[PDB]
Design a protein around this ligand. Structure first.
Ligand SMILES: O=CNC(=O)/C=C\C(=O)O
Ligand SMILES: O=c1ccc(O)c[nH]1
Ligand SMILES: O=c1ccc(O)c[nH]1
Ligand SMILES: O=c1ccc(O)c[nH]1
Ligand SMILES: O=c1ccc(O)c[nH]1
Ligand SMILES: [Fe+2]
Ligand SMILES: [Fe+2]
Ligand SMILES: [Fe+2]
Ligand SMILES: [Fe+2]
Ligand SMILES: [Fe+2]
Lengths: 348, 348, 348, 349, 349
């Protein structure tokens, strides 16, 4: 496990990668459920780098109908919603260390547009240490980004039955290499992957959750297959065993046709993340960035797409990584059978 | 997540429904494992309502042979057993906020018998908020009770194979609608369901735990069927695959034929509880009232029934909700395929 | 300093002297400002003696006009006042361990009349260990009690100028030897002294606070003399230097003529208490029982006397110990120049 | 649940069984993640027995590549590694109460070399109370150890297809009955089982994880079978469904051929431990000693054998209990269909 | 006030001055009443210097007759007395950071004999920060130590009537400049002064506490004079007003003639310490090192001298600094009217 001294040093390293120095101000954003050791490590590491640092503490916001403790489960209002003064307090800093989770929200976007940069850090310290960020991680992720920005379509095939097509072009590419060095940009320690969004109303075909594939935030390995039929960018059919019924029931409950929209799509580039890690954690440990980021996955998602100006506000949100896939950009394979093949500069 | 401010206002709403005001005295009962945020919110809310308040702290009572941390799993003595002073400290109050989980005990019943009312509150704050009690919930549960109090039999059928008969009349009905407003009433925030007990040595037939059904306190969705054969009020056969072998081994561990007796039987009326919720929580989060209360389930139980004057004091205790059941009071259905149909007033 | 393990053992010893065993119930009374180490040691010691134990926690009560943090300085309402349910909660126990201080109030007396016995314990752990009670302290105090109950006058002379007469007989004797063994009786760990009250409207003469004598709760050694003139049981004159002006100003603040009434009078029998100890403590450490109890002092008091049925409810309260005094009961000296001389079996 | 007073009373009873009195010194070893109630209970109990007590606190050690929170996951370096002054601090004690877990590390065997005994105590208080150690547990475990010490081979069969042979002799027998009474010896509260290691490069055959069998630290009940093929002391093949693919992926992650070596083998003698208990716990509660100790299991293990002077220091370490087994010492059965049958004096009432 | 981050940075500075690096081991010694921010800062600073760090925690030791909370009140018995294993755990370290205070105990000198160095650090963080140790401080204190080493007698005089003579030679000179760099040596952060002990049974004359002079641990500025008459190394008379009566009462309470023995004597060399500081603190804040260290004071002491192998075990211990003195070594002044005049290189800038 990670001692307090090492946790502070880890934040020193990541904050320097994020260009924190004498001239920079740092706001550490927290609520009552924020890990106090990570808050303190971020405060002290910032002071050691001679930055001007303060904590902003917000009362927790609660969604009555949200279930479970995973913060990615209900994407709606946040503790910043309605509180313009607290938003101004964060916008006054060069960098925000977010230990309470704001991603996917319009207030985060307004803060980024002021040139403030944001580093989400909410996973447990030992996970933080296993995927401590590197410049080489950034360089590999950025090589993939060069390819993705030029692509006009993404395709996924798997021997389990995936056969999924998504025209591209309308939306930008987003990268996560684990530190917030550029102004006006968000990132998440830990990470190491990239994605974009399909053209409006255009994604089509079949995505098959094989035995062993994962739904977040359920955090289960599927023991029976789930087949998703997708037409015009929306899930229109969910078929299979018990997991299919559970998933159908869960999506039903939000009583909103927007929950079935396909949102972001991409592939993983983090070899220090592990498909097996989720089985070694309890559900309340965190959001399981291992499942999102592991090398050579195909990651897709459902629900809201307003963070790039899509139509859907809906709060129901799922992240679903697939193993053993082929991922093509136009006619070029970037992943073959779950292994990263292109571009060469992105492989580990 | 729920803020301290929100948690205190929630208790103000529930204590007010429970008729706490300046004429009343409130004891907040706790032990070392009680959630200090909930304790504090209850102390604070009671004072805001202008009641006189005090906390009573009991040493934790340990059952050597109980396994796991769920308090509903082993019903033996409690911290109140042989502690008449502590019991009178609770009887001095008009209402007890129970944050330590006094099992249904003879001492609990003698406290209720003096007119003191008891409100159980132990589920996590976010769960308390999702199922915040309402007067409408009480109306709908009372309408159902009216029909249950007159039934001479209850019957349960399912496509999966349940075919279960329970003569009634010997034992009363009991409701749980989330607050303790009448003298001598015990209730549980969150809840929203009702139940009774079969006449002695009388229940007959078959109860099938289908794929997706739940055993508490195991807190798993069954992946293979379990068939329970019942004769003269007792499980006599437990048949199936791994889950059944697990169940057989658990019940034999107590080395007591009383564990196989069917205890309470009833159905759920809480549309804000969710069959899917259990899979979003870890086991030590709480007892999963979502599983017990969700709208239209059939809930039956095994083990002790001394709380209604039955013969069985055994500690081993299971709560088992079933989906997709038809439930009949005499020859009228109250639930059809997991949906509440009667009384109309009880529906959501 | 005192470790946690030693503090529990000390409570074991004093609770045994207090006749706590498996037949006894113990209530540990606390509020937010109670020393948590002493609370826990009391709870754990009572559980080790196999008693039935619980804690009762009351919201703190605030006297708006009270100055400073000494709980003996404003004797009025307590947190028990108007909380009859919490009073019953305490009356249900055989012994109350008071860690929040109730002395001088009617609720404590009604608790004692039920047969409940009360042990105050609020001094620091190190002070509690320096004056750990013994049976031999009890025996010495009771020997002095036998003499005091027969006396019908008390007289004090000092070379510094005291010349004070108090007729006795109207009011009983009170002892404090450090543990609560007899039913319906209060005591204070630590102590070891005894007192009575003068006949109403009868105490007369002069009491001189010499250089080095003490006023509680001020907790100063006088550096200039204060002369108190007493006529018909009341101070009618306060003369001297800065300490006299300070004392005059402080008593006048309560705007109540009852503050000048002489209340309890007696002498100290604790040789493990020290007149020098006060100068080694900060004011918020405790109430300085060393100054009240030290061997051979004369201790008098002002203010309320309704704890024995006198006329005065007033909250202003002072405890003043004098050194080097001669103390006579009728014509026989029990203290000569600050040394205990009679009875012999009370000397140490 | 267990109150502070009872937890202190439990440590008094266990430390007394561990021969702690006024002549003994006790070191309570801890790090930041140690359960503070258990730390405090041991300190206080040792003081009430009038032993000379002190705590030793080490900064936590993190292995970058380790995953999840189970103490047995990464068995490599520890917070003691390279800290020889801290090691000597522990060696000064007669008994160390270990609340951070040094087992499977070289420094532990060196501390035991000096005559210090060590009691591991890391499971939740309620689990500690369910399996509060007893002298009769020690008597039954030692009767089993007699036979194990006399054996030249161990064999396992099961109806699911286990057919496994291990020559014995090279390595000693290790017992765990829950308290550390003898000098220079380690034990674990709770326990109640015994094991040894096979001769180097010699274990052979097949071990089948049947439905319901368990892999630690995964802490799952197998829902489909896994077949382990063993040759010359090493797993050479892992076959089955998803559980097998998960296991293969986990073991290859460490990129070290030594993770496939068979380590300790033995059987369970603790009837107060329960095969069903794991299902009532979350993963972070503890290491699940119920699964290791329950009466009549066959327990084998993979990876490191350095603690008895073996070849392998690898970090990846798995504990796998099997139900329903027949377990033989040479030609004589000690367990049949998961029930302890011999010696008679080892059986529970 | 001092933030957590700054407090860790101070311990980095002081531990480096104390020669802590990757080759060294550091034991942080504490009890329940140790300041936990200081404990944490020391542990963390030692780790960031890549020292091998551990904490050693002892159960607090209470002397029944001890009064008040000052750590110097009842000297002699410590939480270490009779705990040989804990003492060894401390001797395994190169440097002990002492946050519970062992000075004036026999165990401390034994630990130092093994080569372990000890740094006491118990004052509040703000006091630590105001007198953060420096190399120039060490330079000035050693300049003064050179003179004290060659002296055959110390004499004190003051207009208030001090006239005190102490033959020297039998005991060594002890220095305190704020950090523990040399092995086998103890120091105190904060400090900056030096002292020795008079030859056995030889101190003679009078010491007068003037108005404004201080008794520790009473922590009061004298408002009336106290006259101490001294013969053959022992106070034989204590005369004056209320302060004198309080002092006589306190010293006789211990019922032990050894409390009147004169112990260490010396002068203050720390200009960042302040005679006025004590009046801005409460009695439980700390031991008031300002009053012991301030520049030009004369500091003498009563009671124990066992820590340099003397006859006296007694627990009652008093620190008394005097202002406005002339202090002589043989016939040469080192302080005149409370200002430091020699050696020149020991004076403040
Ligand atoms: O009593 C009905 N059920 C509940 O509300 C929950 C737990 C329990 O006491 O059994
Ligand atoms: O890194 C992340 C984390 C959460 C999320 O929803 C997307 N990307
Ligand atoms: O022990 C005591 C304490 C306070 C007091 O006023 C009298 N006696
Ligand atoms: O008690 C234990 C615990 C872990 C292990 O590997 C063996 N024995
Ligand atoms: O630093 C100190 C403190 C106390 C003392 O007696 C000597 N030196
Ligand atoms: Fe997503
Ligand atoms: Fe039930
Ligand atoms: Fe009084
Ligand atoms: Fe193993
Ligand atoms: Fe001294």
């Amino acid at each position: 496990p990670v001692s307090n001294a090492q946790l502070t040093q880890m934040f020193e390293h990541v904050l320097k990668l994020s260009r924190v120095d004498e001239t920079q101000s740092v706001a550490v954003l927290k609520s009552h459920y924020s890990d106090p050791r990570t808050v303190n490590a971020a405060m002290e590491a910032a002071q050691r780098l001679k930055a001007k640092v303060y904590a902003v503490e917000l009362p927790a916001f609660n969604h009555p109908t949200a279930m479970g403790n995973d913060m990615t489960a209900y994407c709606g209002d946040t503790a910043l919603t309605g509180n313009l003064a607290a938003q101004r307090a964060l916008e006054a800093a060069d960098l925000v260390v977010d230990t309470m989770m704001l991603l996917h929200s319009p207030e985060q976007e307004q803060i980024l547009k002021t040139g403030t940069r944001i580093l989400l850090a909410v996973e447990p310290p030992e996970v933080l240490a296993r995927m401590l960020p590197t410049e080489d991680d950034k360089r590999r992720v950025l090589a993939a980004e060069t390819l993705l920005k030029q692509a006009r379509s993404l395709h996924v095939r798997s021997k389990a039955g995936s056969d999924f097509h998504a025209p591209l072009g309308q939306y930008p590419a987003v990268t996560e290499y684990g530190y917030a060095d550029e102004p006006g940009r968000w990132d998440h320690w830990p990470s190491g992957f990239l994605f974009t969004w399909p053209n409006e109303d255009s994604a089509e075909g079949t995505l098959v959750l094989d035995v062993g594939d994962i739904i977040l935030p359920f955090k289960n390995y599927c023991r029976e297959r789930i087949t998703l039929e997708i037409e015009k960018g929306f899930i229109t059919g969910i078929h299979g065993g018990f997991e299919a019924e559970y998933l159908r029931d869960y999506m039903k409950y939000f009583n909103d046709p927007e929950v079935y929209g396909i949102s972001h799509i991409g592939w993983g580039l983090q070899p220090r993340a592990q498909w097996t890690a989720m089985g070694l954690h309890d559900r309340n440990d965190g959001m399981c960035m291992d499942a999102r980021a592991f090398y050579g996955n195909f990651l897709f998602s459902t629900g809201p797409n307003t963070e790039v100006g899509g139509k859907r506000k809906t709060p129901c949100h799922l992240d679903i990584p697939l193993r053993n896939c082929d991922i093509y950009l136009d006619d070029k394979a970037v992943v073959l059978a779950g292994d990263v093949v292109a571009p060469e500069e992105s492989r580990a």
